[PDB]
Design a protein around this ligand. Structure first.
Ligand code: MG
Ligand code: MG
Ligand code: MG
Ligand code: MG
Ligand code: MG
Ligand code: MG
Ligand code: MG
Ligand code: MG
Ligand code: MG
Ligand code: MG
Ligand code: MG
Ligand code: MG
Ligand code: MG
Ligand code: MG
Ligand code: MG
Ligand code: MG
Ligand code: MG
Ligand code: MG
Ligand code: MG
Ligand code: MG
Ligand code: MG
Ligand code: MG
Ligand code: MG
Ligand code: MG
Ligand code: MG
Ligand code: MG
Ligand code: MG
Ligand code: MG
Ligand code: MG
Ligand code: MG
Ligand code: MG
Ligand code: MG
Ligand code: MG
Ligand code: MG
Ligand code: MG
Ligand code: MG
Ligand code: MG
Ligand code: MG
Ligand code: MG
Ligand code: MG
Ligand code: MG
Ligand code: MG
Ligand code: MG
Ligand code: MG
Ligand code: MG
Ligand code: MG
Ligand code: MG
Ligand code: MG
Ligand code: MG
Ligand code: MG
Ligand code: MG
Ligand code: MG
Ligand code: MG
Ligand code: MG
Ligand code: MG
Ligand code: MG
Ligand code: MG
Ligand code: MG
Ligand code: MG
Ligand code: MG
Ligand code: MG
Ligand code: MG
Ligand code: MG
Ligand code: MG
Ligand code: MG
Ligand code: MG
Ligand code: MG
Ligand code: MG
Ligand code: MG
Ligand code: MG
Ligand code: MG
Ligand code: MG
Ligand code: MG
Ligand code: MG
Ligand code: MG
Ligand code: MG
Ligand code: MG
Ligand code: MG
Ligand code: MG
Ligand code: MG
Ligand code: MG
Ligand code: MG
Ligand code: MG
Ligand code: MG
Ligand code: MG
Ligand code: MG
Ligand code: MG
Ligand code: MG
Ligand code: MG
Ligand code: MG
Ligand code: MG
Ligand code: MG
Ligand code: MG
Lengths: 60, 253, 49, 96
RNA sequence: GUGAAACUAAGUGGAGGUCCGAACCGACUGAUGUUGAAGAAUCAGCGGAUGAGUUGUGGUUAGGGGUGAAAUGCCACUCG
RNA sequence: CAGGGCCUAAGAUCAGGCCGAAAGGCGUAGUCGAUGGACAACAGGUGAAUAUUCCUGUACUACCCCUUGUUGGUCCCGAGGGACGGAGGAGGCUAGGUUAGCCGAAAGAUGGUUAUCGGUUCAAGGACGCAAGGUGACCCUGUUUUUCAGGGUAAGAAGGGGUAGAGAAAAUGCCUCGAGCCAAUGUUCGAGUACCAGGCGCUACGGCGCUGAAGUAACCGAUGCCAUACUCCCAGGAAAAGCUCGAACGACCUUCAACAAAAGGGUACCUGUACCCGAAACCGACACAGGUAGGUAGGUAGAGAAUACCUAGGGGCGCGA
RNA sequence: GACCAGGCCCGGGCGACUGUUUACCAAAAACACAGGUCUCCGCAAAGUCGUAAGACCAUGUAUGGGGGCUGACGCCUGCC
């Protein structure tokens, strides 16, 4: 019943960083190539989706 | 006939979960999925515990096979499940061993079975556990025995040699009228976790060898075909030289 | 000799039923906390809703 | 059994950073006999209780921590009923 | 009712991919809208509504692929 | 209180192991992983912005401390338990509501009238307790079988004890003891100098200080509770820990050391906590006629959570004339 | 007496039926279905996925598992 454009919904930050998070890029080889690549371009943030396990941004 | 007991230690929840998905997670065996949660009953197919006197306490439903299953006790207090033989009634006594009476539910090697008997739950391999004739109403006659080898006629009609030292059980497998059921509606299939099947002729040419012709397709294929490109009808798939071949005599008709 | 067994078994029964019942309100309180109208005060501001 | 390891390894002399003096805290002192101390984020309650119990020599009832949105731990230290708050208020230089 | 059984009112019972209809899921007709209030909506009606139902959270399957009650449909407004 | 210091599901990673140009793929123990198991707190008050968190009352878990009582305890292991569907209706109850009764105030410029307006509230928890409820085998006689009445049978229910087999507990078999049992709710404490209609006084005319009457009964009645209680059905309805029990095997620890108990005192880990959340704060590029799980469920009519008009509470749609 | 709140009857085609479908121009006579029938497969099964190891099928065993056509029930299914 929701419009096509709604692809990004409200999803638990926990779930996202279990997908695009830091500790996941570190697992695969291709991810490590990712991080070398981003460091080369020199981005301020390596992993956009990430998340404190506990803290102010924590998802329980 | 069917009355639910509490749970004996024989009933667990551990199992494969995705039905028909392999390691890669791909659907391999098609059409499964959906359907009621089930628990695994640990059957005793081996019946390997010898020379103690077992007693049928109850008869119970099993979701996993279409036969019935019996809770049996012993004097030792161990409890097993066995496949329910046909005509067996609560209070009955069964036993396995070498020198044993021949009656319903008793289990013995093929050395000791009088020829012409009707058997179920048949090991092809010593101590591997019983394999052949485990479904409802399934039964196999022991026709002849010679040398180290005994001959059976399997419920498919196929006549085949096995080892004379492999255990088996007398009596045909119970719950014979199960295929006399008529499901009556779609839902009734879905309850069994069998999903709907699409006919080949219907799908697009990319999806399947009988692909969309204009209106309705006769199969122009010079032959009826698998989803994967092999002749659908009467092409024998048995591995040509498979080790079993010396054993197999007449083929099911 | 029967009065001993009866008073012992009623001591036991009083105990087990004490613990049981205690356990039961505890669970009820939990289910309510989960569902989320718990603290009876909460429920009494909203009775008229 | 063994030596008791403190939750982290800190240096106690840096954990209590300072009293927080605003209109808010002072009446918390008045009512509740409770001091207000900005402390190191990495610092816990057991460490704050030992620290202040030894430092000003007062027995402390209870400690309540907090973390600002700015990531600076803030601790309410409510002392016993015996030792008055305003005592330590004049001892420290916090004037109610 | 006959010796067995069949046959027939009665009560009890509460089956059903039963019926009517909100929530909820849909999307049949019309009107409006078309530099929209909105990159698919509002309005009045309309279909299912104990099931082959709806949904939440957490997962799986990935492009010579996946998934498909099969429309070349869907796979982040992108899919021969 | 919600997650973590507890346990596992789908799933993930995976020591060794198997395979593979490389990167890697499969896979066992292990370890992760809640949306589930386990586990202890409520009422009132304060309050520019927090409150089951701060204050006052009564509570409850887990440790430590003493007294007493025993001598082996701890883990590994063996077990019982935890532990489970759908549908259906009938009970027995509360939550709410309505009307009485009690108490206080009332004159609201009209033809009449007090028929009017307000109040009648209290939690977790602890002690008690359970029938017209529900369950407790059969046989004879009647009440429609039922709720019942007399007799009898000898385990015939929760619940306990014993024995036997390689056999501690368990399972299993034989013997025995028990007519009660179940649990919502209820009575009493908690609980009154709490709360509160009004009354008195101040007005920075915002709010404030002061004293406080009555505080019961009947009838409606849940979709909530007992309750995994029944009855029926086929499609047959999670695991593991805490928990209860226990010999041999292994490991480790041992005397004022450890464990067992009823009192008494003491002691109290991290992280979230603001605000919005049928949204001008999330998702729709907008202060966008849209999407967004769950909880609570008042009145009159009504079969109803539909509809219409209202309470509590919130609003008058950020261009007008 | 407001709001709320079925128009119905007689015919025929197609499809038995509840369902599913082309998000955003098509909801149907299309798909599914219970049922039917043909063929493969004796368990180290056939089939599917992988270079392989192995995984699914299945902790199943021919009253079971693949695959092809048709499509409830009734009457049938001719010749080459
Ligand atoms: Mg971004
Ligand atoms: Mg179970
Ligand atoms: Mg069990
Ligand atoms: Mg994978
Ligand atoms: Mg079919
Ligand atoms: Mg089909
Ligand atoms: Mg087509
Ligand atoms: Mg495919
Ligand atoms: Mg092709
Ligand atoms: Mg074709
Ligand atoms: Mg044509
Ligand atoms: Mg309402
Ligand atoms: Mg404060
Ligand atoms: Mg530091
Ligand atoms: Mg905190
Ligand atoms: Mg009726
Ligand atoms: Mg229906
Ligand atoms: Mg009607
Ligand atoms: Mg349309
Ligand atoms: Mg509409
Ligand atoms: Mg409708
Ligand atoms: Mg209608
Ligand atoms: Mg209609
Ligand atoms: Mg309807
Ligand atoms: Mg039904
Ligand atoms: Mg679901
Ligand atoms: Mg969806
Ligand atoms: Mg689809
Ligand atoms: Mg994109
Ligand atoms: Mg798209
Ligand atoms: Mg397209
Ligand atoms: Mg697992
Ligand atoms: Mg791996
Ligand atoms: Mg390795
Ligand atoms: Mg593993
Ligand atoms: Mg965890
Ligand atoms: Mg949880
Ligand atoms: Mg808790
Ligand atoms: Mg916890
Ligand atoms: Mg607030
Ligand atoms: Mg409060
Ligand atoms: Mg407190
Ligand atoms: Mg009080
Ligand atoms: Mg305690
Ligand atoms: Mg255990
Ligand atoms: Mg459960
Ligand atoms: Mg009821
Ligand atoms: Mg009442
Ligand atoms: Mg009245
Ligand atoms: Mg009166
Ligand atoms: Mg007047
Ligand atoms: Mg009144
Ligand atoms: Mg009480
Ligand atoms: Mg007590
Ligand atoms: Mg009674
Ligand atoms: Mg024993
Ligand atoms: Mg013994
Ligand atoms: Mg026993
Ligand atoms: Mg009544
Ligand atoms: Mg309902
Ligand atoms: Mg509800
Ligand atoms: Mg049941
Ligand atoms: Mg030992
Ligand atoms: Mg002990
Ligand atoms: Mg708060
Ligand atoms: Mg808040
Ligand atoms: Mg606006
Ligand atoms: Mg808006
Ligand atoms: Mg909105
Ligand atoms: Mg109403
Ligand atoms: Mg009406
Ligand atoms: Mg009424
Ligand atoms: Mg309404
Ligand atoms: Mg108003
Ligand atoms: Mg105008
Ligand atoms: Mg209408
Ligand atoms: Mg109607
Ligand atoms: Mg017609
Ligand atoms: Mg005609
Ligand atoms: Mg015509
Ligand atoms: Mg149709
Ligand atoms: Mg209909
Ligand atoms: Mg769909
Ligand atoms: Mg369309
Ligand atoms: Mg659709
Ligand atoms: Mg349609
Ligand atoms: Mg279609
Ligand atoms: Mg194979
Ligand atoms: Mg077959
Ligand atoms: Mg088939
Ligand atoms: Mg067709
Ligand atoms: Mg036909
Ligand atoms: Mg006919």
């Amino acid at each position: 019943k929701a419009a096509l454009c709604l692809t990004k919904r409200s999803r638990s930050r926990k779930s996202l960083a279990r997908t695009h998070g830091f500790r996941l890029r570190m697992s695969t080889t291709s991810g490590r190539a990712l991080l070398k690549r981003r460091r080369a371009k020199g981005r301020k943030i390596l992993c956009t989706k990430t998340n404190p396990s506990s803290g102010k941004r924590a998802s329980p | 006939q069917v009355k639910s007991n509490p749970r004996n230690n024989l009933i667990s929840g551990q199992r494969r979960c995705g039905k028909g998905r392999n390691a890669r997670g791909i659907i391999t065996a098609r059409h499964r999925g959906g359907g009621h949660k089930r628990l695994y009953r640990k059957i005793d197919f081996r019946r390997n515990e010898k020379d103690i006197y077992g007693k049928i306490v109850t008869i119970e439903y099993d979701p996993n096979r279409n036969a019935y299953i019996c809770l049996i006790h012993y004097g030792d207090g161990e409890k097993r499940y066995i496949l329910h033989p046909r005509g067996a009634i609560i209070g009955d006594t069964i036993v396995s061993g070498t020198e044993v009476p021949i009656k319903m539910g008793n289990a013995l090697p093929l050395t000791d079975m009088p020829l012409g008997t009707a058997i179920h739950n048949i090991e092809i391999t010593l101590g591997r556990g019983g394999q052949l004739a485990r479904a409802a109403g399934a039964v196999a006659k022991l026709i002849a025995k010679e040398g180290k080898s005994a001959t059976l006629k399997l419920p498919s009609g196929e006549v085949r040699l096995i080892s004379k030292n492999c255990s088996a059980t007398v009596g045909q497998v119970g719950n014979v009228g199960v295929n006399q059921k008529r499901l009556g509606r779609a839902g009734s299939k879905r309850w069994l976790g069998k999903r709907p099947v699409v006919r080949g002729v219907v799908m697009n040419p990319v999806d399947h060898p009988h692909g969309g012709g204009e209106g309705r397709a006769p199969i122009g294929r010079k032959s009826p075909t698998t989803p994967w490109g092999y002749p659908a009808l009467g092409r024998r798939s048995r591995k040509r030289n498979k080790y079993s071949d010396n054993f197999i005599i007449r083929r099911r008709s | 000799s029967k009065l001993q067994l009866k008073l012992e078994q009623k001591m036991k029964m009083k105990m087990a039923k004490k613990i049981r019942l205690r356990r039961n309100r505890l669970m009820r309180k939990r289910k309510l906390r989960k569902r989320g109208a718990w603290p009876p005060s909460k429920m009494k501001k909203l009775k008229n809703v | 059994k063994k030596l008791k390891y403190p939750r982290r390894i800190l240096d106690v002399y840096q954990i209590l950073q300072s009293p927080i003096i605003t209109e808010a805290a002072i009446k918390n002192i008045a009512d509740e006999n409770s001091l207000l101390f900005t402390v190191d984020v990495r610092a816990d309650k057991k460490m704050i209780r030992e620290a202040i119990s030894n430092f000003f020599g007062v027995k402390v009832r209870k400690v309540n921590t907090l973390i600002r949105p700015d990531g600076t731990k803030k601790a309410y230290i409510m002392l016993n009923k015996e030792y008055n708050a305003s005592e330590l208020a004049k001892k420290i230089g916090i004037f109610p």
